Ligand binder design. Structure first.
Ligand SMILES: *[C@@H]1O[C@H](CO)[C@@H](O[C@@H]2O[C@H](CO)[C@@H](O[C@@H]3O[C@H](CO)[C@@H](O)[C@H](O)[C@@H]3O)[C@H](O)[C@H]2NC(C)=O)[C@H](O)[C@H]1NC(C)=O
Lengths: 116, 105, 132, 153, 52
């Protein structure tokens, strides 16, 4: 629940206008820090097994999603100064591409790990 | 090797008072220093073993005081037969002796 | 019956728990000398002081022996947390009534700047007399 | 490592070393299982203690340990120094940018706070101040004073 | 980075001398520190000479 809500919270940066640079930047990086703090407790319960389980896989995918959101905003802000009409579609693409990707991952994950 | 510097090399003090001899070691010798009193034309006789332990037959006027490096031998109210050489020797390692100290009136 | 009376030393507990809390509270007081138009600055100060107080509290919850009833150090930590909370709420109040009446905002800011250290020192005196 | 005789006073049982005291306690060459310390050497001694039951002979050994500093350096002295240097670097930022300097200073104080909390997880609960305690206190004071300087500006 | 390092120190086996993961974490921290220092230098030397 907390990792999923952290990812859907990091998605909030997309709807914010591109001119609020400190707002979106601090949002992304603070959700990154939150994702790390959550990633700790997932593995705190288990021994030092040298393979990828399902919960550390889930939390790693969530962290990757947050990281990718922040890097997406970074590249968007970089393209703002170079090509504005090009950057105008990146936000509208991300708004649909990030939630659908996370839902597809959730589906395949919760289906593959329960058919076993 | 541990060397023992004994002070003073030669000391003259009269009869009746309390005299002191010092003996400093270079390394650590923990309460393993003995004091011998050698009279001329005689064998050395042990006075103080350990660091402060009077031997069987020595009067209670001799007292020792021990440390890790420097030790003292006090003779309170010296007498007329207490004038001889005094040697300090460490036993913590293979025994080495100090240079000795003469005692004259 | 052979009974002992053990008096718990205080220097360690002071150095580890009481100094950081008071330091973070004094740090939170800084947001009053910052001007009202600096919004991101005062929000950063207040919210980061709240976060630091939370971190200190939850880490001393682990450092201290787990004793599941209320103690004095917990009362002091909660007092410092209340002080930081009140500082941030004071800033929020200032920011709210700023546009409609800036003179009232400046008066509130000066009043807080003068009278939060007073209440903190009063609470310190009361606490340190009651438990000693 | 102090040992001796129970129940037998100095007049009944005395102890001694079987070889020269410098050659009695022999530590095996690979017998130093210390992750943190450095076994320098041994140091034997003999004494007489006085208890309620009499005088007893006590054979003492001393193993001399010296702590390894490199780990504490890398863990606490370099991060704290770097954080304080960062606080001083915040002075060089431009003065007309208030939110940047504010978040810089306060997040630096929070970084020092976390480093200080994690640094006190290793020290046992002693009742005085260690050297790392003084270093951490001075570093914390420097960070707080840099933030106070920014407030003054 | 500080949080990750402190969390590791808490969760990793307490070996009180220097290891390889300590060196790697120190390198990462130095890199973050150097990025922040570079930004500070830029923000200082911009307003007078933006080319540099
Ligand atoms: C720790 O707690 C114990 C027990 O609560 C305290 O012991 C109490 O000691 C007082 C003073 O020695 C005792 O009072 C005496 O009572 C006798 C009655 O026979 C009376 O003749 C004396 O004049 C005196 O008033 C009392 O027996 C004892 N309490 C019990 C139930 O054992 C102790 O003082 C406390 N502090 C320390 C440092 O131990």
């Amino acid at each position: 629940i907390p990792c999923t809500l952290i990812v859907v919270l990091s998605w909030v940066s997309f709807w914010i206008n591109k001119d609020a640079v400190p707002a979106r930047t601090s949002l992304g990086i603070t959700t990154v820090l939150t994702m790390t703090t959550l990633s700790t407790i997932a593995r705190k319960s288990l021994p030092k097994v040298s393979y990828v389980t399902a919960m550390d896989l889930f939390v790693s995918v969530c962290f990757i999603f947050v990281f990718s959101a922040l890097v997406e905003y970074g590249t968007l802000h970089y393209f703002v100064s170079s090509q504005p009409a090009r950057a105008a579609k990146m936000d509208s693409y991300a708004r649909i591409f990030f939630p659908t990707a996370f839902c597809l991952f959730n589906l395949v994950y919760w289906v593959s790990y329960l058919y076993l | 090797n541990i060397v023992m510097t004994q002070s003073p090399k030669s000391m003259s003090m009269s009869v009746g008072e309390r005299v002191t001899l010092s003996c400093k070691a270079s390394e650590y010798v923990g309460t393993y220093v003995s004091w011998y009193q050698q009279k001329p034309e005689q064998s050395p006789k042990l006075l103080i073993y350990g660091a402060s332990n009077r031997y069987t037959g020595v009067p209670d006027r001799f007292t020792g005081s021990g440390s890790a490096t420097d030790f003292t031998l006090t003779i309170g109210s010296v007498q007329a037969e207490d004038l001889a050489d005094y040697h300090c020797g460490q036993s913590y390692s293979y025994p080495t002796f100090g240079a000795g100290t003469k005692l004259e009136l | 019956s052979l009974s002992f009376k053990l008096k718990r030393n205080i220097g360690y507990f002071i150095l580890q728990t009481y100094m950081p809390s008071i330091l973070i509270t004094i740090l939170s007081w800084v947001s009053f000398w910052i001007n009202y138009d600096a919004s991101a600055a005062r929000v950063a100060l207040g919210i980061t002081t709240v976060l630091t107080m939370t971190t200190i509290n939850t880490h001393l919850r682990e450092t201290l022996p787990k004793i599941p009833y209320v103690k004095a150090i917990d009362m002091y930590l909660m007092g410092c947390f209340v002080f930081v909370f009140m500082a941030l709420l004071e800033y929020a109040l200032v920011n709210y009534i700023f546009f409609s009446q800036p003179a009232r905002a400046a008066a509130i800011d000066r009043w807080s700047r003068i009278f939060f250290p007073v209440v903190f020192s009063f609470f310190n005196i009361v606490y340190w007399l009651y438990y000693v | 490592l102090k040992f001796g005789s129970y129940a037998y006073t100095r007049a009944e049982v005395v102890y001694e070393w079987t070889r020269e005291p410098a050659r009695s306690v022999v530590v095996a060459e690979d017998g130093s299982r210390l992750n943190q310390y450095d076994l320098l050497g041994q140091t034997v001694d003999s004494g007489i203690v006085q208890s309620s039951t009499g005088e007893y002979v006590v054979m003492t050994t001393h193993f001399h340990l010296k702590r390894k500093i490199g780990y504490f350096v890398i863990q606490t002295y370099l991060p704290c120094i770097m954080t304080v240097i960062l606080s001083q670097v915040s002075f060089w930022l431009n003065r007309e940018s208030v939110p940047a300097r504010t978040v810089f200073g306060v997040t630096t104080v929070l970084t020092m706070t976390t480093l200080s909390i994690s640094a006190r997880n290793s020290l046992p609960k002693v009742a005085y101040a260690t050297a790392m305690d003084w270093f951490i206190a001075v570093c914390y004071a420097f960070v707080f004073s840099a933030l106070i300087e920014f407030a003054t500006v």
